[PDB]
Symmetry: D3
Subunit: 306 residues, 6 copies
């Protein structure tokens, strides 16, 4: 019955990520923006309804939920954990509102972001405004196909949508965002076989490496987590490449939706802290998480009732 | 006989404007890059040939030409003139190499720019990188359709391509680049009729205003320059919007190609210094020029012979 | 009977509205066509099936229903009410059968209409035939974006499809059709701010005006109807621009699908008769309704299995 | 060289034909419009530049040419000849101005026609306008593929544009406009083989019938005129299906461009009056001409220089 | 609840049919491929996600089911019946594994087939490989529109998906595959009306012939089977044209999905053996069946759990 | 003045290569087909001409020219020269007529080939028929991008169209066709760096290797022929991947157009016989030539005058 936000939509060719902090006394402005965001998205996106698939997902951080709403907090909504392994660390950056805008053209995303920021001209403060674009075969900046094993259909619904465990917030999701900056020089220093061993998949054919050859510290092996029931826990992640050529900045904005934050937290702990058979993820040797945050994206019905 | 660059192409949806300055001792690397920029463009763009429309235009500033080539300089190639008008001024900023990359997708432009700057590591210091996107209705940040009256066909090449006036540099062109930052807050405070009077075109229908009603200080009226023999002086403009909603940065990157810089300089003088019947252009009351430069784009044959 | 006649399909770029009336003795061939309309639509559309998205919706008027079928009538399905306000009027032109054809290309719609009328030749009288096309940003003849606030997903299904209130006719809908001829000269005589105040949304960015500034007599304000339980009533509408510049004729064909006709009747009454705080809709000052009719679009299986 | 109009354009999905008669005293309005038709077309069609492919062609009748322009007349521009055949006839209807608008979507053509008629309010009387649409395989309403043997490339330029025979009007063309109402019942009453014999080509594969079995009175055979020197005489046709289902009106709007009207006049005479081996064209047994006119489409610079 | 193998996917423009026979001792490799086929399809098809629509359907023959799996068998699974009609005979050919690959481009299908065969190298013998391409308007080699009356929506699910009748194998389907070679010259010898009477539909308009004129031995009149309870028995068919001009070979590869094989068996018996009012199907006079097999396509969950 | 036979057309997604041998006494039928091939191509293509891009190129072998035409012969026409290298051989196969059909869909190519072969039924013997498909990323079966360095525009016209050196046959070209079978099993055993060194270009980004480190026996370094006057000899080649997974056949059909066969013969001699610094091309260690022929594709007007 509850209507989830557009989190199950397929990834498009253009996206904008807005991580924004809320200034003191701007709670009412944020409330009315959350009420009107669906109408704003519809108005901006209907001008190109046949093609463009404009979709805005709004999430609220743990530190802002108790300041905006006086009801019951969603279960598991907590500030992003600080993971500091022996070598790499995951830093948590301030963030209260997440606006994830996706469309086939950057113009629609820019217009929607402009409208949203205009409605919040003097009540908030931007933190991590980022534009992201796709490549030829949906590749990332590391040259590998990204998001191949994303759950689809009913599997995605079971993986990312909150069910009867939190009846008051059915249809919501937990989104973990993390901006990484790559080291392209070191990555290009390695051979293609070394890159495949680091990732765990073939670079050209995208065929997953055989289990008897896949290294224990590869990114794919460490992110493959199986729960107590024997089924593999999965999340609907949508990485977006980004960067500026002049500043020699290349990176990836990872966003991951789940029905509970525990799956993403376990994946991050395995990647950073490492398992018994692997000190840490190999992909972290060439990628540093410059920012990280956690948000809760509620159902559209909850947002429309403010 | 000479082969001009891709300066005569339809305005694509995505573009990257790179302006860089050559450091000391980097002339040899710049020459090496210019000797194979066409090959790099072909290699990057052939991967998506039918849908993609990748095209890179390379231009050399007046300062860089003396230190790069020992031959005769192109006629009219001079450092960008700075106009100190009574109210507005056109600032001239350093720049020695311009790469104007255009494609239907931002990924191709980003890959080409990455390859170029990787070839130019250490040799040049980046000065201005702009990622321009084109709206669904190829409108400006002011909401007006841009490039409607661009010359096309034989008129375009007769207006932008150097002919027999400079036989040694036939097929080249002069490109004036200028970055404008718009004051959207003040622009939105004007009625649609006021905006149309400022621009000189109808906002929705894009129909030019009548001669008896068009204001003398409108942008279209001031940029319409008649030649000494009754002909109309024309330039090719590929200005595109750009900006980021995080910093309240909304702007337009203007690039203009001509046979000689005299036409563009006259248009700029009319816009900034004004006319006897108009103190200055009205569009400058809402746009501020923060970067201006002039470059010469030679024929592909000239670049391939280095 | 869960089988709607594709009335939830998104708006396409080309459409044909065909309202006809059946003369005496034509009740037999019309029945034969109604059992073949789906097959004809499939046969015409499958050629362009990858992107043709051809869809035909058939509706039966109040008189035509009890003229053709001898079963129980659907709840409602009254002849279209004629509203005669202090200034504007809503005429109720005769109409028995409505064919709403939608496709990305006009050729598919024209072929389907040609086949339908060839099967119907000699037994119907064409009351109205309108070819509608879509502008750039789904604009209407007034220059505003049309259909922005259309319900989508499960909300549209709950808003247009008949539920358990009429179990015998589940999956159907009630379609109200009207033809408006705009006064383009008067509309262009107004400033853009005046046009936005008349409509209720910004012309450029399609963002609707704030509550404290939106006029009480604007079209959007008057068509925003709140139900007795606080839930706003919604309908699915596909307004198609049409006209010919030779006759200086410009207009919009409005079609509205609802679960019950009462919602559309209330919206029309508020637009024409007006409320206490607004004499009538402002958009009616530049639009004149030349036709008007109400039809019931039954479920696909009901048309296939006549009774 | 003179710049030709948009006559040399490919067949397009949507078209509008607008034939009007200039009222008394409305010469000045038409004259000032003709200098603005190119600007109006550019303004309207630029909004959909990548795919709109909007193009407007303007033609002037003989009486309209006499009333408007006081210069020399083109070699053609005689009032459309009315052929009184033994069975069929080609009526000549009044017409002074022809606007042929072509675009991929009918909205562009409608907007351009609206602009033109608004500029022509109170000065012209619309004789008739036709909204033409293309079927699946560019077919006509008779079920056959239309325009298969149209000239292309330099051959079309030689057979359409006016050359050195009339140097003062180089780049123009002569357009013959006719409106045919088909008898679909009689056409459908014929077998497919009979229809192919009527037309002269196979309906299925669209291949031409072999010359030993093609009937002498077939449409293809009769409109295959051989020049005095043995060179084939050809014209460019852009037939547009049209009709209204409610009125049971089905028909084709034929427009034919030539470098001289005599080619189209000879084709029409062969079709209607017939040859020695054929009383008349067979396709005329199912098509009735209800509107005929002849116009001259001048070069773009001629219209601009007014 | 169980997820099918996307047997309800819309018809695409390119397909590959691969029928192979498992060699002795190759059961383990076949099981591994059946486990990894979903991952292989996801990896190959993700490179072109928006377009392409790559989908692979895997079916196991009756002779191979008892060799690969143990414990239970589908109720309807059995070796394909051979029909020895008075004139036409439907031959049964050895087939153990069926791979039906569909995509908008043949390259994706070829890559998927290459991966599958490489995984199966040394374990299976390729009995048949067919590359089918969609014709002009979904026509077949006979020129008639193919697939017009396929069930869609919930009707297709009720017609092709196994329900509560076989709970252990819910979500599966039964696929009957045949390869017909056409006598194109003899078919073209017939008139268009004769062809329509043989098929039962209009050649151009695809309108079904009236019941008063439709021949009793036409293809449509013979494949229209009414159920015992007055319902209509329906199957999902994807007929793919194929052939080579060098060998003068043209044909259609027919695949039919059903919830039970009884419907397809009844249709084949009516087509070949014929009813009381028709000796056999008329289309069989111009088509010869050179291949026939029956396979069971289980739910994706069953294939994954191996 | 002469019209080229659509040789300069851009590469499409689907192609059909037909090589046939004229039987004794079938010269008249071949002449009739050569006369009617343009009409057949137009008739087949105009159904999908908005985006079909169908184009048929016809070439006549050296032996067939002496039989079909009794006039003068093109200077460069001669039977294909078989090269017997130390380890590799270029076999010459009997081929009299070449039909190279290109279109965005295999449907148009198959229809055109069917019509052509039907007109040639009983007159020619089909020696070879290849259905070539083009990968999603313009790659070949070796995983590298093909045709990156193909000449375009004026350079291509100068390089592939014969001019004043043979005025009687101006507008024609010489096409060399070869059928290659690849050893994918051995090719995949090499590292990506080894594959790049064999080819001579980067596999990922298609960037040509630097002048140093580039092997002297690489394919690119061996097909880069410098003319006597310091210019680079270039040909327009359209390699098409092809094969079947059932027979484990993978290969590339190479077709190369030139203004004279000397350039292609020199390239083949360098690849097979080898230079002083390279025994032979490395790519030949994984590709075997099973077919080789040379044809002369004349101008369209030459074929239309039969
Ligand atoms: C710079 C950071 C990252 C990059 C470039 C990256 C890229 C990739 C790539 C190329 C793959 C293989 C392709 C595919 O499976 O679709 C993959 C797999 C995956 N990654 Fe990431 N990833 C990053 C960070 C993360 C993080 C932070 C998480 C979780 C917290 C994550 C979770 C996963 C999962 C669940 C899979 C699929 C595992 C499987 O298929 O068994 N990734 N990633
Ligand atoms: C006569 C000419 C009409 C025109 C040009 C027109 C056009 C429009 C436009 C531009 C809007 C605002 C944009 C949008 O909501 O998508 C709108 C809103 C709407 N109109 Fe109309 N309309 C017309 C007549 C009608 C009629 C006759 C009805 C009902 C009987 C109706 C019902 C509505 C509704 C329900 C809305 C939604 C407003 C909201 O959800 O806040 N309109 N219409
Ligand atoms: C009145 C209804 C007409 C219809 C339905 C029609 C349609 C056709 C068709 C289907 C063809 C064969 C396919 C093709 O050539 O593309 C054709 C050929 C042709 N028609 Fe028409 N046409 C009509 C009138 C005319 C008129 C009035 C003229 C000239 C005054 C004309 C001139 C030609 C020419 C020149 C050809 C090509 C001849 C050739 O290829 O040798 N047609 N027409
Ligand atoms: C037999 C299998 C062949 C394959 C797979 C193949 C593929 C390639 C590839 C990948 C390239 C580099 C990328 C590109 O130029 O687009 C290339 C270059 C080239 N190849 Fe081939 N080729 C083959 C045979 C031939 C033959 C037989 C010839 C001539 C008789 C030839 C002539 C050329 C030429 C002229 C170039 C351009 C190199 C340059 O301009 O620097 N190739 N080929």
């Amino acid at each position: 019955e509850p209507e989830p936000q557009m989190v199950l939509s397929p990834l498009t060719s253009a996206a904008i990520f807005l991580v924004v902090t809320i200034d003191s006394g701007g709670e009412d402005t944020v409330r009315d923006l959350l009420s009107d965001v669906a109408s704003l998205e519809r108005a901006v996106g209907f001008r190109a309804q046949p093609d463009g698939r404009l979709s805005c997902v709004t999430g609220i951080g743990s530190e802002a939920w108790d300041r905006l709403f006086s009801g019951a907090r969603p279960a598991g909504l907590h500030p992003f954990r600080e993971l500091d392994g022996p070598v790499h660390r995951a830093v948590a950056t301030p963030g209260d509102l997440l606006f994830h805008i996706r469309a086939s053209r950057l113009d629609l995303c820019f217009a929607l972001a402009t409208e949203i920021m205009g409605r919040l001209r003097g009540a908030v403060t931007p933190q991590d405004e980022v534009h992201g674009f796709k490549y030829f075969d949906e590749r990332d900046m590391l040259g590998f196909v990204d998001g191949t094993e994303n759950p689809t259909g009913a599997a995605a619904r079971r993986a990312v949508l909150v069910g009867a465990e939190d009846p008051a917030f059915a249809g919501g999701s937990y989104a973990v965002v993390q901006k990484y900056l790559h080291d392209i020089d070191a990555w290009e220093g390695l051979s293609v076989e070394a890159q495949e061993r680091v990732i765990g998949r073939r670079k050209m054919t995208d065929v997953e490496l055989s289990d008897d050859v896949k290294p224990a510290d590869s990114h794919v092996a460490l992110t493959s987590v199986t729960g107590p029931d024997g089924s593999d826990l999965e999340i609907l992640r949508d990485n977006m490449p980004f960067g500026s050529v002049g500043r020699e900045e290349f990176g990836t904005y990872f966003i991951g939706y789940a029905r509970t934050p525990e799956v993403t937290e376990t994946m991050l702990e395995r990647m950073f802290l490492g398992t018994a058979s692997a000190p840490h993820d190999r992909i972290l040797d060439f990628s540093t998480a410059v920012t990280g945050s956690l948000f809760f994206t509620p159902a559209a019905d909850f947002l429309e009732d403010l």
